Amino acid sequence: SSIGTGYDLSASTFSPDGRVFQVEYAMKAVENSSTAIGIRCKDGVVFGVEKLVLSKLYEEGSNKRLFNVDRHVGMAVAGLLADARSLADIAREEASNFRSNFGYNIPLKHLADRVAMYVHAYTLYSAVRPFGCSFMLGSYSVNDGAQLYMIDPSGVSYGYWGCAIGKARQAAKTEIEKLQMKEMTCRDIVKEVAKIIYIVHDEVKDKAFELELSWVGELTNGRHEIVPKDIREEAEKYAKESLK
């Protein structure tokens, strides 16, 4: 059933139940999207998403749902791509300012907090709508281990050993639960991620997809990067073979 009062219209409003409906609607918008997965490993973290190809006309590596918010940290996104790009710009600028002031790479759990505060700020004023993009942020450092943090539209930030966002986040979550990521290294974890992003995908529901991977870890000297093509081909082949 549907509510016609108008409580749900403006974000700067509370429902009598105590729920702000605008942000929940934005979370549903996040749910209506292609799945994105991030899995941490002892060496580093891997990001894997399904970039649905809407038309063959579109060339390749477009509508990139992977972003490098900084040298050492990378973002994998879901939901509305424009809002996600705005968030990426915000994170980039925050990291720039932190480096300028404090003279070292911004830590995770700080960047996530600031970006979350920006998101949350968009919630509680009447004029502006909540963001429609939830995203995962991950980086690796020698001082601090591989970190993965997920941010929702509501503005909550939480570290995840593994996390998944999108239409099939639940299926991805149970598959990731059927895993041992803590000991496993990034390279095998890549194979696993290809397996999950392949199984969750519905070939009938979604016509076709181009798989994008990204990871950051000790092997990469703590720099986020777009996954050498040999490894990516090997992983996609492994995932399809596991699929059959």
Binding site: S2, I3, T5, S15, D17
Partner: peptide, 18 residues
């Protein structure tokens, strides 16, 4: 059965008519 969802705290008018 469809009207069962209609009753809710949020909507007074919908709640009453339901």
């Amino acid at each position: 059965m469809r009207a069962l969802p209609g009753v809710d705290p949020n909507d007074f008018s919908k709640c009453m008519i339901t």
